[PDB]
Design a protein around this ligand. Structure first.
Ligand SMILES: CCN(CC)c1ccc2c(N(C)CCOc3ccc(C[C@@H]4SC(=O)NC4=O)cc3)cc(=O)oc2c1
Lengths: 255, 256
């Protein structure tokens, strides 16, 4: 029944709103234009912005490093939101406890870069709950190998953002990403796929009603899972390279 | 209109059959095992020597070269099939080249799954069957050349697509708007949109009791890219350890 699928759509939207304080709607208002965010385009802007915004990741040590570490701090925050949001997906909490951990472990990066797109345009990214805008050109300009940390995520955001998904679409797509049966170490795939099948049915009905003239948007969206897993792959490949530049309770909080 | 999409599905299924001599339906009849189509089985170096006589240098290299000559033949069939896709041949010629360059290996591993089960692979048009084990036991670096394709084929094959479903799926793969260097993305995407609509109607009619097959099949495209990626890594190893080992110019140009 449609009524069922719409019920599931609204349920996930309502929970997405409660879990994620900076929404796409909010992020779009801010990026296009009353209270312009503080812009970091250069080093002397950044050094002013630390003294203007009360950044939560700063401690008592070169700039590129401190910016990268700040991205880690936010990702750990975003893991807790996505965790909480996942518990609202019907059937999720009833899975085997290890598979809940396994799906979250392998799902959070995909969802991070998806939701990052909501805060991005060709020109930069909203930081610190949209209090800041860091320009793509000052990110691009950092020392090797941090210089093009974000460049992949920008290219992926620009192409994602062409689909014009809104928050009520992303709520369901994020749910589909968490419930992937192809994650390694899953003990009981069947119920995971049963819930993902229902999430895809809802995602299909939501795209058809919310975007009635965007042909095959469902298919184009699923195609973007490919660009997600590729961004993620080559992100770990930039990490494993950090462990050959980056020359202890902190280390633990992040891993 | 479903009538236009059914027409396009039949068009594509008819070209597929004209273009690929060894279909999935034929490959399955050989594997499940009729008197008239029993293949010769290579499971060790003894049986390899014997088979090299009944079917028609070190073994690892001879096999790898064989897979290469077989990709080169497959590129020719995929090229012929591509020309049959309404609109392909009307695109900018540079984009035709770029769509074949990136699509061909994703199609080769899709269609190689048709010839595979969890024990081995059909070779020489189904006259031979070479066991997963035998291919695993090859000296490094060729030992693990075939495993990732086997792993992908096991999982692809559980969708139980027949040739009519595959003919549309490989059309979707060729008409991919996101290939690097594409001059004119939008005309490819309008072809792909229509192919996607055709695949979606095909899967619901041919597999009515297989929930969200369409979305399961489109996620497989991530598994294909990974096969291609691992393989290029494996080739750059081979080119250093095996300096006496020829590479077919046509695949060298595809790998550039
Ligand atoms: C005397 C040669 N001989 C006996 C020893 C054989 C041996 C085997 C095969 C064979 N096999 C085993 C299937 C393996 O399938 C593959 C594997 C990989 C590719 C991709 C290629 S490899 C590369 O570097 N670049 C590519 O694009 C394509 C197909 C089929 C066949 O038709 O003939 C055969 C002959």
């Amino acid at each position: 029944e449609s009524a069922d699928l719409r019920a599931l759509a609204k349920h996930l939207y309502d929970s997405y709103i409660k879990s994620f304080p900076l929404t796409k709607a909010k992020a779009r208002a801010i990026l296009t234009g009353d209270k312009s965010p503080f812009v970091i385009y250069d080093m002397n802007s950044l050094m002013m912005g630390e003294d203007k915004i009360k950044f939560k990741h700063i401690t008592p040590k070169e700039v590129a490093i401190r910016i990268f570490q700040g991205c880690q701090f936010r990702s750990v925050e975003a893991v807790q939101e996505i965790t909480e949001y996942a518990k609202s997906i019907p059937g999720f909490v009833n899975l085997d406890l290890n598979d809940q951990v396994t799906l979250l472990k392998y799902g959070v990066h995909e969802i991070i870069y998806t939701m990052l797109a909501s805060l991005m345009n060709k020109d930069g990214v909203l930081i610190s709950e949209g209090q800041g805008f860091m320009t793509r050109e000052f990110l691009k300009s950092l020392r090797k190998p941090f210089g093009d940390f974000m460049e992949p995520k920008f290219e992926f955001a620009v192409k994602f953002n062409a689909l014009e998904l809104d928050d009520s679409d992303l709520a369901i797509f994020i749910a589909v990403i968490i419930l992937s049966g192809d994650r390694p170490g899953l003990l009981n795939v069947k119920p995971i796929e049963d819930i993902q099948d229902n999430l895809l049915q809802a995602l299909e009905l939501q795209l058809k009603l919310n975007h009635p003239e965007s042909s095959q948007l469902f298919a184009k969206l699923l195609q973007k899972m490919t660009d997600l897993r590729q961004i993620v792959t080559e992100h770990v490949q930039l990490l494993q390279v950090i462990k050959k530049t980056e020359t202890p309770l902190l280390q633990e909080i992040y891993k």
